[PDB]
Amino acid sequence: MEAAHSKSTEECLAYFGVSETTGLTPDQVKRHLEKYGHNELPAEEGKSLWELVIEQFEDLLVRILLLAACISFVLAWFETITAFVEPFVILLILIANAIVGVWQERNAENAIEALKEYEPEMGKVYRADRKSVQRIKARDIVPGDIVEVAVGDKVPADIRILSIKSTTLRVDQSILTGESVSVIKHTEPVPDPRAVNQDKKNMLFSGTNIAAGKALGIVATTGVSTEIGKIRDQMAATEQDKTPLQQKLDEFGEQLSKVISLICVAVWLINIGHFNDPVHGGSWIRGAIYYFKIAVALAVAAIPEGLPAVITTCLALGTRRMAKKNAIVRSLPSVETLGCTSVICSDKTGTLTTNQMSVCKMFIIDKVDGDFCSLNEFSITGSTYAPEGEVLKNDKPIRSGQFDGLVELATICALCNDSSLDFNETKGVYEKVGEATETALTTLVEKMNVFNTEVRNLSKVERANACNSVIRQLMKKEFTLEFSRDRKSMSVYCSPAVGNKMFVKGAPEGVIDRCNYVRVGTTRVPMTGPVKEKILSVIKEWGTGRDTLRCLALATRDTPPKREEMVLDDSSRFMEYETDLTFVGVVGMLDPPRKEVMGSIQLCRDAGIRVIMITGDNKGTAIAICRRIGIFGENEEVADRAYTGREFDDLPLAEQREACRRACCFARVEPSHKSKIVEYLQSYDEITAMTGDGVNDAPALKKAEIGIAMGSGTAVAKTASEMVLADDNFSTIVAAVEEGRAIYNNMKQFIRYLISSNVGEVVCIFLTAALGLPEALIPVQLLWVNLVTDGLPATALGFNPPDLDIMDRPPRSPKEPLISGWLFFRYMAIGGYVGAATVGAAAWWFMYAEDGPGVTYHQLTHFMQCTEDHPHFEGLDCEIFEAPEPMTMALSVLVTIEMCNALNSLSENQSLMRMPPWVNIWLLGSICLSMSLHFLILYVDPLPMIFKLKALDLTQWLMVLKISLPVIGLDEILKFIARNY
């Protein structure tokens, strides 16, 4: 049954054809099981380790490296023990990344799997095969089963309550909405078919816990058809878009594949003269090997092997840094999307305010005389739940007992209240026991002390519930009509130890409309026009004005109906029992905003981040609270920038999307509205942060770019969110967004640094193949630089001091490329220099170097013909063309250039003369280690044979410096162009 809440208990039994006493027959269970399936959510389609490994090798760049490794293995097979080092190192990189990926997925947690912790293992049913109850597996429960639940039981399916075998039935529905008080259930049907779950007073939802009582019911839906099952299907459908940087890697990969292939065509076209080369000759087996080991070098030089290690280590350190600021980020790639947040949708009571109620104002009727009227407004000091306060009128201490209207006012707050106070010695602070708005009333009557009781000598524990207990002795709480959203009030039936009385509290409009009289001290006066208008006017002054208070109308029924003429089980008749009331007074309490929220809203204004408030208050107070914390101006018109649940649904889908682009406040939203607002924001390409703390909020948290859960929220809300606020404070979001922009600012820099190095390395290898020179750089050397020599200053670039105007700029566009425009031309000139500096360095030692054999450029270009001992050759040893020394010139030039290029990466356009290189201390320290590591591989005896290197003379290093140092001069010239032109 889709709408079993709207059907009577007889209609539900008639639908399935099951008796409440006998239960489903064995043949009915057979057919109901085949029709509706088993009472369980679908299992996770877990990927195999093989599936992950394939995923690791699905990336094009990884595939290129694997191909290069294979070519290297073959070349090593047909070539010195060092030969197979190159294949192994490449493979080790790939293997490690895969292991990292596998570990990441294993650590990852799935919210849908979390939903299964709310699936009980067992369930109690009544079936026709046995007379007594049967405790079967909850998986085997089918719709139409007669199910019994009691205290401690977890509800196994969506159950329509048939009969409550106890006095009352209280259910803990906290998994749906978060930390909440138990809800009373009944058996009468709910008229509205489109009613929300909060109003389904006759339904037991799967996963909830029975707080107290015992009832018999009939199963309405099972599996994915339950309310918790519908939420799973919404989460399954939600697709997680790749972070902008992840998409850029996909872009950089496919564009790099085109350049590598076009270079292979370019080298073939440049060396097309080999078609006119004679046929007889052994240089063809050497030629194919020459271009194959250049292809391996071309792949290593193009791919930044160390970039993922530097990226994942900067995000991991930023997560530890955010954790000290109470921001628990779960996914590392989501830190980039955190700095890109454009709209923040936040709840109020948990995040924007402290959720610590306290009565601040109250008024009782002072005098009614025809058209004249006067009230007795009061002020209450003390913002905590402690009974330490003072009642004031016109800022003057008063004794509350001297006013008779306050005596009846306090008895309502003490009796029409299900909460209490309690003192904790481990913290020395009075704590809350129950609802926050009800605990404020118990604290209020303690500050009043309307009976002038002596509490000075009472202990702190006794002081907490002392004046309340006195009032509790005077009257006897017979029964309680619980709160319901249709009448928005609750009442209690009391008798003395004079006839009986009823004390009512609730929303002002509903309670005052049911008042026919007005309490004036101890007398009674009929409710008239000018009195009701004076009362309702002060209601709007406290709820809409600067006070932003939540008002509660308090009334009594001096002549309640007879006890036998009342039915305490019909929740629909509760409003009829709460009629013909006498207005006593109104109590207004404040949910104060946090201290750091007002400044955090202004930081979002300076950073171009829009804040949207989501409350449960009426539209008048929600707009008033927005004007208080800074969402709206005090005199700013907000006719089309604030909506409610009914207002938003009464709009067509066209005007709903237009409303979400200008709205900054949503009051009393339906459960589906959070996911609808996210989609409308995403339709405008907004990066939306959404808050929530229950399974109801779980689909909206996954749909939003960044779900934000509460540290005190449910486990499902945390597993569904990208960030968890440890202190539930809204300011943690702004601090996490600020840190997200700061991380990406430094992250943008070392990416450009490592990428520009790969550009210069390719130009170096393209010049080697286009001219026919010996290999100036070997893939083993390039891997050592791209992983270690350049990876250390890249990590150091992640610690660059952040800009002082980060929160003064609009959020970054996700489609903004890292390198484009004039910067794209810079790294071409820089890369064109590195490629020419390294190739020219190795060609120097071969040609103009005194320490090295002078050789003609033709000989160097035609060095593969040395074997002939041609007359064109001078009989020079052919082994010279394989000498180690020249590869050290190209390597030391490349290393020193990247050390200089790392200094130029401290700023995009600012000069080093203006922003000095010693701004980042970690960058200078990383350069020292990287250079020392260069000497380690140059001098420590095992390493240079592995890297095919030899030490350089003090004269040779000066040649490296005069070739590498002009990089700073070249890059400063390019920076000087962007600044002044």
Active site residues per annotation: 347
Span interacting with ligand VSR, options 270-278, 299-307, 339-347, 779-787, rule CB under 6 A? 299-307
Query: Given CA atoms 141, 145, 148, 151 in this order, what sign does their dihedral have?
Result: positive
Which of 149, 161, 169, 307: binder of ligand VSR (CB under 6 A)?
Answer: 307
In the block, residue with structure tokens 């389904």: 200
Does position 791 interact with ligand VSR (CB under 6 A)? The reply is no
Q: Reduced to 3 states, what is the DSSP secondary structure of residue 6?
A: coil
Q: Which of 127, 248, 447, 514 binds ligand VSR (CB under 6 A)?
A: 248
Nearer to ligand VSR (CB atom), residue 308 or residue 854: 308
Q: In Å, what is the CA distance from 53 to each residue of 48, 101, 254, 421? A: 9, 8, 21, 58
Place of tokens 């001078």: 874
What is the biggest distance separating any 2 CA atoms in the chain, rounded to whole angstroms? 132
Q: Quick check: 755 binds ligand VSR (CB under 6 A)?
A: yes
Q: How far apart are CA 421 and CA 468, in angstroms?
A: 10
Residue 29's CB: how many other CB atoms inside 10 A? 21
In whole angstroms, how close is the CB of 253 to ligand VSR at the nearest point?
7
The token pair at 304 is: 């930044």
Q: Residue 330 binds which entry of Na ion, ligand VSR, none, with Cβ cut-offs from 5 to 8 Å by kind? A: none
Residue nearest to Na ion according to CB distances in the complex: 707
- The H or E element spanning position 213 is none
Binding test (CB under 6 A) with ligand VSR, winner from 758, 768, 789, 901: 758
320 is in an annotated binding site: no
Residue 650 counted as an annotated binding residue: no
Beta pairing, strands 122-126 & 134-137: antiparallel
Beta strands 642-644 and 665-667, pairing class: parallel
Q: Is 47 annotated as a binding residue?
A: no
Position 303 contacts ligand VSR (CB under 6 A)? yes
Residue in the block written with tokens 């240079």? 944
One-letter amino acid for residue 913 of the chain:
M
Q: How far is the CB of 660 from Na ion (least distance, A)?
A: 18
- Residue 136 contacts which entry, ligand VSR, Na ion, none (Cβ below 5-8 A, type-dependent): none
Task: Identify what 308 binds: ligand VSR, Na ion, none; CB under 5 to 8 Å per kind.
Answer: ligand VSR
The verdict on 827 binding ligand VSR (CB under 6 A) reads yes
Distance CA 692, CA 657 (A): 22
Query: Whole-number minimum distance, CB 334 to Na ion, in Å?
Result: 8
Four-point Cα dihedral 802, 806, 811, 814, nearest 10: -20
Least distance to ligand VSR, CB of residue 339, Å:
16
Sign of CA dihedral 644, 647, 649, 652: negative
Of residues 626, 720, 621, the one with CA closest to residue 674: 720
- 585 belongs to the binding site for ligand VSR (CB under 6 A): no
Positive or negative, the Cα torsion across 954, 957, 959, 962? negative
Q: List the beta bridge partners of residue 667.
A: 615, 644
One symbol per residue from 799 to 818: x for binding ligand VSR (CB under 6 A), - otherwise; what is it? ------------------xx
Which of Na ion, ligand VSR, none sits in contact with 707, Cβ below 5 to 8 A by type?
Na ion
DSSP annotation of 350 reads: I
* One of 17, 281, 282, 308 touching ligand VSR (CB under 6 A): 308
Structure tokens at 175: 């998994």
Is 777:760 a contact under the CB 8 Å cutoff?
Answer: no
- Site membership for ligand VSR, residue 633 (CB under 6 A): no
Min CB(315)–Na ion separation in Å: 17
Q: What angle do CA 731, 734, 737 make, to 5 degrees?
A: 150
Among 322, 490, 575, 762, binds ligand VSR (CB under 6 A): 762
Footprint of Na ion on residues 664-723 (CB under 5 A)? 702, 707
Q: CB of 97: closest distance to ligand VSR in angstroms?
A: 6
Q: Is 819 in the site for ligand VSR (CB under 6 A)?
A: yes
Helix (H, G, I), strand (E, B) or coil at 583: strand
Q: Is the dihedral of CA 593, 596, 600, 602 positive or negative?
A: positive
User: Encoding tokens for residue 839?
Assistant: 């190739």
Instruction: Name residue 732's beta-bridge partners.
Output: none
The smaller minimum CB distance to ligand VSR, of residues 228 and 298, is found at 298
Residue 212 or 836 with smaller CB distance to ligand VSR:
836
Which of the stretches 58-66, 215-223, 413-421, 500-508 binds ligand VSR when contact is defined by CB under 6 A? 58-66
- Please tell me whether residue 768 binds ligand VSR under the rule CB under 6 A: no
Amino acid at 246: Q
Point out the annotated binding site for Mg(2+): 347, 349, 693
- Chain contacts with Na ion (rule: CB under 5 A): 702, 707
Point out the annotated binding site for Ca(2+): 300-301, 303, 305, 758, 761, 786, 789-790, 898
Point out the annotated binding site: 300-301, 303, 305, 347, 349, 438, 485, 505, 550, 615-617, 668, 674, 693, 696, 758, 761, 786, 789-790, 898
- Chain contacts with ligand VSR (rule: CB under 6 A): 61-62, 65, 97, 245, 248-249, 251-252, 255-256, 259, 302-305, 307-308, 751, 755-756, 758-759, 762, 817-819, 824, 827-828
